[PDB]
C-alpha cells in the first residue's frame, strides 16, 4: 500500500515509499524462517535452550 507523496503540480509526479519493519521482523531471510530469523525477537529463545 505504497505511501506515495504527490509532489509535482502535475498529477502522478509522485514519491514512492516503502516500510516493512515491525517487532515481528528481525533478520529477514525471506520472512520468519521459523523460531529464528524473525522470532527470536518475538519468542526469545532465552529460557533454557541457551543453557
Amino acid at each position: 500500500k505504497n505511501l506515495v507523496f504527490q509532489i509535482g503540480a502535475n498529477a502522478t509526479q509522485q514519491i514512492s515509499v516503502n516500510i516493512e519493519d515491525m517487532g515481528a521482523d528481525a533478520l529477514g531471510i525471506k520472512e520468519a524462517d521459523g523460531s529464528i530469523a524473525a522470532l527470536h525477537s518475538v519468542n526469545d529463545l532465552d529460557v533454557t535452550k541457551f543453557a
Partner: protein
C-alpha cells in the same frame, strides 16, 4: 443617410448591450476560473497527501 445613422445608433446600442453581455459571461467565467484554481489545489490535496 439619416436612415444610416438611425440604424447606426441603434446598432451602437446593440454593441454596448453586447459589451455588457460579453462582460457578464466573461466575469462569470473568471469566477468559475477562481473556483477551478481552488479545485486544482484540491487535486493536489485530493492527491491524498500522496496517500
Amino acid at each position: 443617410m439619416r436612415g444610416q445613422i438611425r440604424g447606426l445608433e441603434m446598432a451602437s446600442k446593440n454593441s454596448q448591450d453586447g459589451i455588457s453581455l460579453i462582460q457578464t459571461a466573461e466575469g462569470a467565467l473568471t469566477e468559475t476560473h477562481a473556483i477551478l484554481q481552488r479545485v486544482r489545489e484540491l487535486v493536489v490535496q485530493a492527491g491524498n497527501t500522496g496517500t
